[PDB]
Amino acid sequence: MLTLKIFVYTVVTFFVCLFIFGFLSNDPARNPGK
Amino acid sequence: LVDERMNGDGTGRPFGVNDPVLGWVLLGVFGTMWAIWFIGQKDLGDFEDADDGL
Amino acid sequence: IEFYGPNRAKWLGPYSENATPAYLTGEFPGDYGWDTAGLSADPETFKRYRELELIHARWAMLGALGCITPELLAKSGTQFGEAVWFKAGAQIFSEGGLDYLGNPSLVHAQNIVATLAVQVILMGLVEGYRVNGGPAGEGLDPLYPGESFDPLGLADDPDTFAELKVKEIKNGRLAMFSMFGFFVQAIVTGKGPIQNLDDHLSNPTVNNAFAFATKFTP
Amino acid sequence: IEFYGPNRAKWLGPYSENATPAYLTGEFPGDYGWDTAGLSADPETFKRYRELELIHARWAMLGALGCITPELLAKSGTQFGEAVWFKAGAQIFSEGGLDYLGNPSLVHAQNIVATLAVQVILMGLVEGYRVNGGPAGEGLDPLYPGESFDPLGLADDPDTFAELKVKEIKNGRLAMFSMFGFFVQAIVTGKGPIQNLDDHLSNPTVNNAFAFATKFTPS
Amino acid sequence: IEFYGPNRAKWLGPYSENATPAYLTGEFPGDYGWDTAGLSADPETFKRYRELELIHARWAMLGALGCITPELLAKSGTQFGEAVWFKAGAQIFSEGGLDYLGNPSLVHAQNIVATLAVQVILMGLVEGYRVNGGPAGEGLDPLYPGESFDPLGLADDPDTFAELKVKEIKNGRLAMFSMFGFFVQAIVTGKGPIQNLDDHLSNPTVNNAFAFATKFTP
Amino acid sequence: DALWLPNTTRPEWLDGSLPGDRGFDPLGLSKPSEFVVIGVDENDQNAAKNNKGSVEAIVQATPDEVSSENRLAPYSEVFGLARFRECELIHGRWAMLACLGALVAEATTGVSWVEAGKVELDGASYAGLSLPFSITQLIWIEVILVGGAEFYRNSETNPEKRCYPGGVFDPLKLASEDEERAFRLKTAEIKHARLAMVSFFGYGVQALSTGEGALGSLAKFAD
Ligand code: CHL
Numbered sequence: 001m002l003t004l005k006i007f008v009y010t011v012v013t014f015f016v017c018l019f020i021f022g023f024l025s026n027d028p029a030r031n032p033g034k
Numbered sequence: 035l036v037d038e039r040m041n042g043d044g045t046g047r048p049f050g051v052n053d054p055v056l057g058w059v060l061l062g063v064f065g066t067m068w069a070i071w072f073i074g075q076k077d078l079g080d081f082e083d084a085d086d087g088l
Numbered sequence: 089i090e091f092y093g094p095n096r097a098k099w100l101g102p103y104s105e106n107a108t109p110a111y112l113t114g115e116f117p118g119d120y121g122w123d124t125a126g127l128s129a130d131p132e133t134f135k136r137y138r139e140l141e142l143i144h145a146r147w148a149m150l151g152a153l154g155c156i157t158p159e160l161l162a163k164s165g166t167q168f169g170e171a172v173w174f175k176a177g178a179q180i181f182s183e184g185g186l187d188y189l190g191n192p193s194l195v196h197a198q199n200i201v202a203t204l205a206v207q208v209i210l211m212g213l214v215e216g217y218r219v220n221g222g223p224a225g226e227g228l229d230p231l232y233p234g235e236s237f238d239p240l241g242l243a244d245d246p247d248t249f250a251e252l253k254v255k256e257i258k259n260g261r262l263a264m265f266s267m268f269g270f271f272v273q274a275i276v277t278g279k280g281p282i283q284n285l286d287d288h289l290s291n292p293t294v295n296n297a298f299a300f301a302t303k304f305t306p
Numbered sequence: 307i308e309f310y311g312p313n314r315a316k317w318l319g320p321y322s323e324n325a326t327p328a329y330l331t332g333e334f335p336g337d338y339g340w341d342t343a344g345l346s347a348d349p350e351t352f353k354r355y356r357e358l359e360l361i362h363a364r365w366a367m368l369g370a371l372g373c374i375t376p377e378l379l380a381k382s383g384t385q386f387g388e389a390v391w392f393k394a395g396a397q398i399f400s401e402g403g404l405d406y407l408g409n410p411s412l413v414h415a416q417n418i419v420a421t422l423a424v425q426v427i428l429m430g431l432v433e434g435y436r437v438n439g440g441p442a443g444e445g446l447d448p449l450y451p452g453e454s455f456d457p458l459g460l461a462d463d464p465d466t467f468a469e470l471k472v473k474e475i476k477n478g479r480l481a482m483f484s485m486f487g488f489f490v491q492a493i494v495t496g497k498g499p500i501q502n503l504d505d506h507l508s509n510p511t512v513n514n515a516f517a518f519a520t521k522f523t524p525s
Numbered sequence: 526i527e528f529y530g531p532n533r534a535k536w537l538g539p540y541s542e543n544a545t546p547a548y549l550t551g552e553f554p555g556d557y558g559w560d561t562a563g564l565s566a567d568p569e570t571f572k573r574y575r576e577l578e579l580i581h582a583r584w585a586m587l588g589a590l591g592c593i594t595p596e597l598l599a600k601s602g603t604q605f606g607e608a609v610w611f612k613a614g615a616q617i618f619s620e621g622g623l624d625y626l627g628n629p630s631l632v633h634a635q636n637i638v639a640t641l642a643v644q645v646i647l648m649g650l651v652e653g654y655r656v657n658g659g660p661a662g663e664g665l666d667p668l669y670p671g672e673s674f675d676p677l678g679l680a681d682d683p684d685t686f687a688e689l690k691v692k693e694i695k696n697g698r699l700a701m702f703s704m705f706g707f708f709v710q711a712i713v714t715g716k717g718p719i720q721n722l723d724d725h726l727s728n729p730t731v732n733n734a735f736a737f738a739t740k741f742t743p
Numbered sequence: 744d745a746l747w748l749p750n751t752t753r754p755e756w757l758d759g760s761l762p763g764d765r766g767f768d769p770l771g772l773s774k775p776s777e778f779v780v781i782g783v784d785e786n787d788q789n790a791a792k793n794n795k796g797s798v799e800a801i802v803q804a805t806p807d808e809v810s811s812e813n814r815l816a817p818y819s820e821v822f823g824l825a826r827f828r829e830c831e832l833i834h835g836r837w838a839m840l841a842c843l844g845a846l847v848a849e850a851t852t853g854v855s856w857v858e859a860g861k862v863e864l865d866g867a868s869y870a871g872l873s874l875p876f877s878i879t880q881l882i883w884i885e886v887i888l889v890g891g892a893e894f895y896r897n898s899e900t901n902p903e904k905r906c907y908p909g910g911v912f913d914p915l916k917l918a919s920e921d922e923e924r925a926f927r928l929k930t931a932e933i934k935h936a937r938l939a940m941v942s943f944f945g946y947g948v949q950a951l952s953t954g955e956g957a958l959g960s961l962a963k964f965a966d
Pocket residue numbers: 391392393394395396397399422489492493
């Protein structure tokens with residue numbers, strides 16, 4: 001079950017880190033703008 | 035006992051971590067994603083006071 | 089540029105003599121002005137002190153990371169014999185030789201004078217090559233060569249490499265001061281340093297340093 | 307080969323270190339380039355460093371042989387007591403004073419503070435003489451007055467005199483690097499150096515130095 | 526040139542009387558002037574003695590290394606029967622032949638007269654080729670051809686080529702003197718030379734050379 | 744002068760500029776022969792009366808052995824010296840290394856190159872020193888490293904240097920900058936390659952003939 005548990009934490013933390021470092025990566029300027 | 039199980043309910047451990055092998059994976063994903071982001075910092079907007087707001 | 093010039097971040101803030109020393113004004117990374125003894129009034133002396141300081145820095149980084157890493161790994165999940173860098177050297181004598189990483193199927197090292205001989209030969213080779221210039225790069229800069237042993241190639245721009253110079257020196261000075269801390273803690277408490285951190289975080293007011301303040305009494 | 311000039315025997319062999327300190331260019335015995343620290347850019351400082359190196363070399367020469375010889379003689383054919391130079395200052399306090407060569411038929415000097423006073427007066431006078439001259443030949447070179455110091459006088463020919471300077475300084479460098487070794491052996495094992503050499507010739511492959519490595523472990 | 530010329534280093538160095546036998550002033554590698562008996566005052570005889578000495582040297586190196594090798598391999602990781610050049614000749618008559626490299630799966634040679642005949646035929650051919658030069662290498666030089674049997678060919682720079690001549694001759698004189706030492710040790714002790722060196726490292730003061738001084742008494 | 748057939752009819756496209764050139768073509772597999780190009784047939788079934796190919800249509804596409812940049816099939820033809828030299832050299836160098844390695848492994852350990860896998864999947868004993876690896880990790884490491892090596896050796900565009908690369912890294916001693924010395928070294932290397940390929944073929948035939956070891960066969964030979 002530990003082989004599963006490492007994999008679940010890996011996928012979860014990969015997607016959460018992708019989320020956080022996406023929103024730090026210049027979000028409110030990728031609009032149609034003015 | 036009869037069988038084998040982690041017995042992780044009711045423990046109260048940080049991030050549900052039991053093995054340090056399980057503990058290293060958090061930093062091993064977080065640091066590499068941070069490093070890819072910090073490399074990708076090259077092609078973004080860095081500035082003195084060019085701020086994005088009213 | 090903030091980091092070096094006539095208006096750098098000097099070593100006392102507003103209290104840094106209101107002026108640099110007259111024999112150094114920027115032009116080199118890591119210049120704050122702290123030479124109060126004045127040991128580098130001559131420019132060739134000053135160049136020798138840079139050429140010595142940068143090498144001590146680049147050794148002090150590796151000496152720090154090699155004195156952190158086994159106390160992490162053995163206390164987390166592995167086996168080493170002893171991981172503390174006191175007894176990291178005494179693992180050849182212990183039971184069957186020095187098992188690297190605690191595994192009697194890789195290196196399993198004995199014959200300590202042979203390891204000493206291999207060290208003397210290879211370090212003589214690389215410390216002669218660093219002075220004259222041999223294979224895998226001709227000797228062109230004694231401190232910042234920048235050739236095929238630097239494969240990723242970040243030193244192409246002048247300004248970003250000029251900032252990375254200061255980053256390397258700042259990390260170097262920190263690593264040297266930390267290694268001096270490792271050595272003095274090693275003399276005083278006789279315990280591992282991450283073990284000292286885990287002992288300090290339990291009770292910060294009484295396991296501070298001042299419990300170990302009457303050890304060296306005459 | 308060629309002791310000073312352009313073609314002096316610089317170290318590192320093939321690794322000819324050709325970013326040498328460009329202010330040490332021959333003209334003085336023993337120029338191999340040990341200014342990696344570069345501590346001698348000023349010529350007056352460099353002159354004082356020669357004036358201190360040669361005195362340290364000669365005092366290490368005179369101090370080494372007196373720390374090798376009596377242990378050899380006590381092993382071979384005499385007896386002394388504490389032959390090893392740890393309690394060389396304590397053999398005066400042993401009975402009432404030291405007997406030289408193991409013979410209670412000479413001076414047997416008591417009053418160790420008076421012997422200290424005689425040593426202080428004589429050494430103060432001779433070191434005051436060595437700086438600014440005086441009797442026994444007035445000083446013209448601080449490194450080698452040598453006129454009242456040579457009943458033989460081999461300092462005539464200049465090339466042989468320069469080669470004797472080079473041999474003198476190399477022997478002095480070896481004497482200092484050996485006396486540092488005797489100090490370190492004295493701190494580590496606390497024995498005689500000839501006894502250490504006998505132990506190493508008895509067991510080279512095991513009793514080398516690394517058995518005497520876990521002694522200063524702090525805890 | 527320190528090695529050969531008007532100011533070479535002779536067989537007595539500072540005590541070399543500023544005089545060899547005066548019929549030779551350099552011009553060849555290996556010249557110190559040690560013809561004390563004057564055995565080569567005639568120039569063609571002197572040329573013949575060079576042509577003989579160089580062949581004895583080039584066989585002496587191979588003989589020395591062949592005498593050194595098999596005791597080292599038997600010490601390291603193999604067994605050869607008798608790995609010493611006393612009985613290496615007698616290894617043919619051992620049980621079923623001479624098993625090369627201590628392995629009874631490769632050559633396993635018998636028939637010593639047939640091996641001698643093969644040796645005689647092949648050495649006659651190659652020595653006749655060394656005399657005159659036929660096909661597969663034309664006869665152009667008596668001692669220093671520099672042809673298709675010399676693949677690296679370091680005779681491009683002539684001064685370094687003369688330096689390598691000097692190195693070859695120095696190794697030749699060393700190899701001859703060493704092989705004479707092997708022969709005299711083989712007469713006296715009846716043991717392998719590496720075993721003799723092991724005996725001397727075990728006991729220098731008693732097993733030096735004079736233990737076998739009362740051997741050949743009348 | 745020293746052909747396989749000494750002073751006979753030589754092939755036209757073999758001269759001697761290549762080092763191991765001895766005029767050897769009974770088959771003529773390196774021939775400069777052209778290729779008759781036939782166009783595509785009328786495969787448009789919207790209209791009636793479709794047709795077929797075109798007989799003696801094109802000028803037959805004069806073959807060239809110039810190395811291109813495409814990572815899949817760079818040379819753009821197989822039958823040519825500018826592929827066959829490289830194939831012979833690479834096969835010969837692998838055969839030299841393999842024929843030396845089988846003999847050294849049989850001499851040291853005593854296990855054939857045939858039966859080495861059966862004694863090395865259970866224990867990774869390089870001369871009995873018990874390496875920690877297992878078969879899956881060996882296959883992973885082998886595939887990724889030899890693949891990186893092959894993808895880096897295909898990147899060279901010089902048809903000379905795809906088998907004779909030169910430079911600094913591979914010629915460590917620089918003994919091939921000469922004309923005649925390097926020509927002699929190439930014509931020695933090709934003969935040693937031609938020996939080693941045939942002897943590894945002999946190893947394979949001895950393996951087919953009910954087991955061998957290249958000295959286990961000699962232990963069979965023992966009387
Ligand atoms: C200048 C050289 C010199 C040195 C290095 C020593 C040192 C010594 N004396 Mg000695 N003395 C020296 C000259 C003289 N002493 C004396 C009078 C006495 C007496 C009465 C006694 C000694 C004793 C000792 C021994 C102390 C044991 C010890 O602590 O071991 C530790 C040291 C080591 C293991 C090695 C040394 C390490 C280090 C390199 C020391 C050197 C320090 C500095 C480099 C020297 C300072 C330079 C200048 C200022 C002098 C040790 C051999 C005592 C003794 O024999 O008991 C055992 C003792 O009772 N000395 C006189 C007459 C005044 C001297 C004349 O110059």
